[PDB]
Amino acid sequence: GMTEYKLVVVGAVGVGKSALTIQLIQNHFVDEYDPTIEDSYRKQVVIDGETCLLDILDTAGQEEYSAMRDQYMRTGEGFLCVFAINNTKSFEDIHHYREQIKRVKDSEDVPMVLVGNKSDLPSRTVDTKQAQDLARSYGIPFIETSAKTRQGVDDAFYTLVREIRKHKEK
């Protein structure tokens, strides 16, 4: 079979995880998607000449059993850590997602990309510089996205695939 990359999109409720995933897979912006629904989505794509399968888990936070959360973190190969540029709390939450994923995977080398979503909104409480400072500290890429206009969306997911490839070649 072609290579499949298991990606997981994490972050506070309301940041745009669903809107980002649906833009990537279906190429439309979704206004309202129930905040409590967690699903995975597949799309065949071509990234730097490689035909491959993205299998994206759009998370929604607490699970019926914590074992479920630990199971998708161990299965996931790379994680998009999303905050919204107008929600400082969602940015502060990134610390806990970075920690938790490394802790479950018991790894210091987990492919991740920091994503600051809703870049189309003039309303902003998290400046680019602050998010760059966090990404520099983690040694991972940082991309600002808009699920609404699609700006940065392919970049965020494809950069994550590229981080996964760097990890695999070691």
Which residues sit at the interface with ligand GDP, rule CB under 6 A? Answer: 11, 13-19, 31-33, 35, 117-118, 120-121, 146-148
Q: Per residue, what are the HEC states of 112-149?
A: EEEEEECCCCCCCCCCHHHHHHHHHHHCCCEEECCCCC
| Segment interacting with ligand 0QR, rule: CB under 6 A, options 44-52, 69-77, 106-114, 138-146 | 69-77
Buried b / exposed e over 30-44, threshold 16 CB at 10 Å, is eeeeeeeebeebeee
Sequential DSSP letters for 28-43: S--S---TT--EEEEE
Q: How far is the CB of 108 from ligand GDP (least distance, A)?
A: 27
151 interacts with ligand 0QR by CB under 6 A: no
76 binds ligand 0QR (CB under 6 A): yes
Contact residues toward Mg ion (CB under 5 A) are 17-18
Is the CB of 56 or the CB of 85 nearer to ligand 0QR? 56
Q: Which residue is nearest to ligand 0QR (CB)?
A: 75
Binding mask 27-56 for ligand 0QR (x = CB under 6 A): -------------x--------------xx
CB neighbour list of residue 7: distance below 8 Å, 6 or more residues apart:
54, 55, 56, 57, 76, 77, 78, 79, 80, 157, 160, 161
Residue closer to ligand GDP, measured from CB, 52 or 88: 88
Cα–Cα distances (Å) from 32 to 38, 90, 130, in that order, read 14, 19, 29
Scanning the structure block, which residue is given the tokens 């991740």?
112
* Least CB distance to Mg ion at residue 34 (A): 7
- Contact positions toward ligand 0QR, by CB under 6 A? 6-8, 40, 55-57, 63, 68, 71-72, 75-76
